Amino acid sequence: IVGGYTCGANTVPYQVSLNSGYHFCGGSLINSQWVVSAAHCYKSGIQVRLGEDNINVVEGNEQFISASKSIVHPSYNSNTLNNDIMLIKLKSAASLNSRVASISLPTSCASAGTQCLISGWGNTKSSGTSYPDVLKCLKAPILSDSSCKSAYPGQITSNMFCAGYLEGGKDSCQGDSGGPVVCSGKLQGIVSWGSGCAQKNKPGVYTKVCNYVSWIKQTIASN
Template sequence: MHMRETNGFTLKKGRSAPLVLHPPDALIAVPFDDDDKIVGGYTCEENSLPYQVSLNSGSHFCSGSLINEQWVLSAAHCYETHIQVRLGEHNIKVLEGNEQFINAAKIIRHPYNRDTPDNDIMLIKLSSPAVINARVSTISLPTAPPAAGTECLISGWGNTLSFGADYPDELKCLDAPVLTQAECKASYPGKITNSMFCVGFLEGGKDSCQRDSGGPVVCNGQLQGVVSWGYGCALKNRPGVYTKVYNYVDWIKDTIAANS
């Protein structure tokens, strides 16, 4: 679930094998983090997360969250010129009858630095409003920043292995706590900005991973995080790093208002 790997870190976006891009552009078959799936999680109850969407460009490559009937929030590193948003999904390889496939009309990245990667957040305007029902509905934006120790739910169709690759067809879930900012910064010295936070387990074993990127971190019913990056997946002292949605609520509201 992270855009895990660029300049030594892994972006959790990805379409295929567990390949991590390193500075000399060498590809190696070890943990990568750029759109991963959940490691150490469980299969979500079908259609229990109606805000979860799959971003598709020939195949699933990232996730996002429906924040109103015509707008999806995702990660900037998930940008593609043509995106089909797939709502109401559980098994992304099977047509189950609840899906809505809607093309993106506008894709708006926050001014974003892929090298840091700060401001990893993006809005997608749907070409037509989603039909809201029991299997497709919105998630609330945060009214306060995420508090350390809060239990959150992370979800996605990303890689389920720390080493190697195994991409699930069914949506995976992981319950994990928000870490303190001190723990987060100690895990990634010099890399964590005020617009990032860590969720997970310092002992490793549970994390988001490739192809989870852009997906939701929901705490107490509010969308607190967007899957962004990390070093590998589920490694000791390398928790997942997430975009802090609270810092961007004004940008989100202003951008939607300006593009309605």
């Protein structure tokens, strides 16, 4: 997250860190046994780390659970990143408490202008590399599709939306992929892609979760 602030320990209780010997992507807990992340974060051998704040220090509120199965969206296209979403089932159910909570799925899509909270342990420099150990947060609004499509001609589908600042300065970045974009208490997006980080006229692109609620509900109930 570039231009954001330190969230504070466990203030984003549904945020998960996907680890395969190191942190490589974020995710969101939707219920005690399931996590939603980005399909491009797919790897075999994932351990889900819940209740984290500093990912390099065991502070006492963590729960590290291995994944029993991963399901990438049936129509995920790695070349365009269309349908960039995946579900991960935990080997054991997590214990929900103050520090570990699930986030609600949306009943409708959000409007341009809605402010959202984006979080993650990704790079914090637009030009440079600095990976933080504690969770960073960013409040950003959903942008109009017109400004989104003008920034990325021929690359935005109906399963994506842009959020951020066209002026640059504030944005999600690599290391943040798969993490949550929560607006009005619902999970509306998943950090997916962009062009560099915090560049002018290059906002972040997110998977539009409201288009996948039926697939999510159906898939978790059958697995």
